[PDB]
């Protein structure tokens, strides 16, 4: 675990609040003061009290793998604590929350472009994350954070590993588990319908078993009320049905990147799901 995550000494952690519940224990926001003396805010989460080893090895191998990434659009471990108790990790404190959270209290507040910006930075972090050679298996917009400047970060690494949530996983990934970065990409797919969507859930309260079967008929998700005819068609792109026809991560920024240059394509406009 110190391989990746320097241990932090908790006589400069402060404590400022309950901010969110986790798996392994509470979520807290508070200070870090560096060794540099500079004072930071951070997110702290807790391993709860009466952890058993495997709690431990669980909660702090999360910590070891964000270690590993350093990234503008990747959530960044500023450390843990692991010889005082209680157990914590420390990483860069996101005012905004969760992205899906954040949009649901803000439909339609958004500029086109802007929403572009925060797709585009969580694509950005996804072509390091898949450039490092690890697949995420849980990119939803309940798994990106978003600051003050409105800057995503792909974060909770709980079902990451080197090279599940039905509603996100591809087609093959659920047919036989074949996790590979198109599948993350077709992830992403769902993310970016989310976002467009203003944090609207994917395929709704659809049955799980009927969220498989349409999609593995052809069927996806409609386009969002007033979606951009070029976001529409990305969506569409990422939910190939052969993973070798979605485009790479890095396909994926270049192309949003023209998107912000010229807001003026966006000008152009697009059963519940469509086949
Ligand atoms: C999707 C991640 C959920 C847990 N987490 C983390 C986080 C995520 C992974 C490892 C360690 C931590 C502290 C920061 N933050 C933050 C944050 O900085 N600011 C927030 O408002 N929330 C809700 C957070 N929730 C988290």
Same mark, same amino acid.
């Given at each position: 675990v110190h391989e990746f995550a320097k241990e932090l000494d908790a006589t400069n952690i402060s404590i400022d609040k309950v901010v969110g519940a986790g798996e392994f224990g509470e979520v807290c926001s508070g200070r870090l003061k560096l060794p540099?003396?500079? +004072?930071?805010?951070?997110?702290? !989460?807790? &391993? !709860? #009290? @009466?952890?058993t080893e495997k709690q431990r090895r669980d909660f702090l191998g999360e910590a070891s793998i964000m270690g590993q990434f350093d990234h503008p659009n990747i959530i960044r471990l500023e450390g843990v604590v692991t010889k005082?108790?209680?157990?914590?990790? #420390?990483? +860069? =404190?996101? +005012?905004?929350?969760? &992205?899906?959270?954040?949009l649901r209290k803000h439909d339609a507040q958004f500029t086109v472009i802007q929403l572009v910006g925060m797709? %585009?930075?969580?694509?950005? @972090?996804? !072509? =390091? &994350?898949?450039?490092?050679? =690890?697949?995420?298996?849980? &990119?939803?917009? %309940?798994?990106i954070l978003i600051n003050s400047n409105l800057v995503c970060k792909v974060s909770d690494f709980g079902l990451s590993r080197v090279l599940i949530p039905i509603r996100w996983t591809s087609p093959e990934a659920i047919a036989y588990r074949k996790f590979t970065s198109a599948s993350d990409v077709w992830s992403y797919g769902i993310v970016l319908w989310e976002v467009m969507s203003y944090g609207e859930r994917p395929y709704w309260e659809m049955s799980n078993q009927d969220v498989i079967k349409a999609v593995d008929e052809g069927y996806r998700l409609p386009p969002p009320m007033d979606c951009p005819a070029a976001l529409y068609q990305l969506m569409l792109d990422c939910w190939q049905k052969d993973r070798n026809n979605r485009p790479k991560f890095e396909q994926i920024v270049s192309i949003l990147d023209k998107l912000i240059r010229n807001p003026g394509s966006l000008k152009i406009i697009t059963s519940n799901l469509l086949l």
């Amino acid at each position: 675990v110190h391989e990746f995550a320097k241990e932090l000494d908790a006589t400069n952690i402060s404590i400022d609040k309950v901010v969110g519940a986790g798996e392994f224990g509470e979520v807290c926001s508070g200070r870090l003061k560096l060794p540099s003396k500079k +004072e930071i805010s951070v997110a702290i !989460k807790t &391993l !709860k #009290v @009466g952890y058993t080893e495997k709690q431990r090895r669980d909660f702090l191998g999360e910590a070891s793998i964000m270690g590993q990434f350093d990234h503008p659009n990747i959530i960044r471990l500023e450390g843990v604590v692991t010889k005082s108790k209680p157990v914590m990790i #420390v990483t +860069e =404190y996101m +005012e905004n929350g969760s &992205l899906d959270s954040f949009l649901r209290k803000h439909d339609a507040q958004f500029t086109v472009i802007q929403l572009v910006g925060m797709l %585009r930075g969580i694509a950005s @972090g996804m !072509k =390091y &994350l898949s450039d490092m050679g =690890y697949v995420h298996r849980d &990119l939803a917009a %309940r798994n990106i954070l978003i600051n003050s400047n409105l800057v995503c970060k792909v974060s909770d690494f709980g079902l990451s590993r080197v090279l599940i949530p039905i509603r996100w996983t591809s087609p093959e990934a659920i047919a036989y588990r074949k996790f590979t970065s198109a599948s993350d990409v077709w992830s992403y797919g769902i993310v970016l319908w989310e976002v467009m969507s203003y944090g609207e859930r994917p395929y709704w309260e659809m049955s799980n078993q009927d969220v498989i079967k349409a999609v593995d008929e052809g069927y996806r998700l409609p386009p969002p009320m007033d979606c951009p005819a070029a976001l529409y068609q990305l969506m569409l792109d990422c939910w190939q049905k052969d993973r070798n026809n979605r485009p790479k991560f890095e396909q994926i920024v270049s192309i949003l990147d023209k998107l912000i240059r010229n807001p003026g394509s966006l000008k152009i406009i697009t059963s519940n799901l469509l086949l």
